[PDB]
Amino acid sequence: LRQQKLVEVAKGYSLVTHGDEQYISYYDADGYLVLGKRKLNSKQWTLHRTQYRGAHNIISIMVDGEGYLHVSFDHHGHKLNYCRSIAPGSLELGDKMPMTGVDEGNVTYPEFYPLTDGDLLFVYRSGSSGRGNLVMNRYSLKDHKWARVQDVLIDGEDKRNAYWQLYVDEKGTIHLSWVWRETWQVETNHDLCYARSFDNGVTWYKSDGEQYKLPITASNAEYACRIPQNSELINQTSMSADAGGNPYIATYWRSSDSEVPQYRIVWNDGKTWHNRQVTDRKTPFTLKMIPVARPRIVVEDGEIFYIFRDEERGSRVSMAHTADVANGKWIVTDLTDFSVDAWEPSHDTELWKKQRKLNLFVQHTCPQMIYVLEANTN
Numbered sequence: 001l002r003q004q005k006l007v008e009v010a011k012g013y014s015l016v017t018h019g020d021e022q023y024i025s026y027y028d029a030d031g032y033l034v035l036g037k038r039k040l041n042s043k044q045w046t047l048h049r050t051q052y053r054g055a056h057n058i059i060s061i062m063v064d065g066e067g068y069l070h071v072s073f074d075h076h077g078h079k080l081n082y083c084r085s086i087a088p089g090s091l092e093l094g095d096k097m098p099m100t101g102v103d104e105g106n107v108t109y110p111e112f113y114p115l116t117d118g119d120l121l122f123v124y125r126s127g128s129s130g131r132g133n134l135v136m137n138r139y140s141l142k143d144h145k146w147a148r149v150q151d152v153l154i155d156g157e158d159k160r161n162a163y164w165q166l167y168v169d170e171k172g173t174i175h176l177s178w179v180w181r182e183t184w185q186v187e188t189n190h191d192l193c194y195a196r197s198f199d200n201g202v203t204w205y206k207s208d209g210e211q212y213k214l215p216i217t218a219s220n221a222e223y224a225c226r227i228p229q230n231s232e233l234i235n236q237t238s239m240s241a242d243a244g245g246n247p248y249i250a251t252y253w254r255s256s257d258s259e260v261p262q263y264r265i266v267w268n269d270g271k272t273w274h275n276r277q278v279t280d281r282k283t284p285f286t287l288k289m290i291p292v293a294r295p296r297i298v299v300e301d302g303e304i305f306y307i308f309r310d311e312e313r314g315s316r317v318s319m320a321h322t323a324d325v326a327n328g329k330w331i332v333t334d335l336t337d338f339s340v341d342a343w344e345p346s347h348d349t350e351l352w353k354k355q356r357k358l359n360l361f362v363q364h365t366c367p368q369m370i371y372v373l374e375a376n377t378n
């Protein structure tokens, strides 16, 4: 036990590195939104209880190129809740403020991403039409303002909803993938679709270089994988990309000849889509507490670290690792030797891109101690 560390934060009911500091956000026992930071390679957190008290309880944070922390949280799912630190490096937040002042009345699932040269992307689920719709904004560091990038990017044309995940790669390309859902029931999830943008969201492409004419519907979407309804396909997972801009999507579903849903990796190598089963599960479950977690991935030129949690492994924090997604065997290990129950993984996206260090937000999930697990990957 030389390498890996389980670093205490504090007890609670995202995680992002900027420079040599790691920031964290969580709700304490009294329901207050807390912002914290540490120097990397130390275990001392500075923890700041904010003035804000808590699509139930979601917090997204990101630091811009000037070092300001941007924070958005979703409690009630109505008006946008968005704040910014008072100064570079500060954990103190200002008053709530608008972004564009348009379509900010029915906001859930806020998400920030970094863009090239210190700008930020913001994506949220807008309910102002009556159904969830992906709305995308950009924060320009040179004029210190938010602008709308797309009002309608994925269009379910009154027949369906979309559940998306995004990743901004090390070259500044925005990757987007999603599943469709036909009705209120989770069993009506189907398919995995893809798009990417090289120009901060103005123009979108398929992986084969064909340009989309927006909006993207079920008819014109690129299908990374055709997966029918009633396949135990989960919605709202995650995706990543390697340094070469190839996308990787982590999710799970059941093949038509099995009763057992399996973790999957779906990726495009520049020529075609592939998918591969990640572990060798034996225990059936249906979505119609889910016994497995939505997965997270980090990648290094085809080498994958695939983080999950499964009742078959005692609900530990688990990892599947392959040296090469195309040809190598998966090695499956547990990063903890204790159960974290209903935990789902999240990781410090920026720390992996900048330093190739994998840090996970770990907490026993039904006040429980929050930890940063510093995993070994090389």
Ligand SMILES: O=C(O)[C@H]1O[C@@H](O)[C@H](O)[C@@H](O)[C@@H]1O
Binding pocket: 065, 114, 115, 116, 117, 118, 119, 168, 169, 170, 171, 172, 173, 350, 353
């Ligand atoms: O240069 C920047 O600010 C950002 O550029 C983005 O494309 C990268 O994904 C992010 O890791 C960088 O921090």
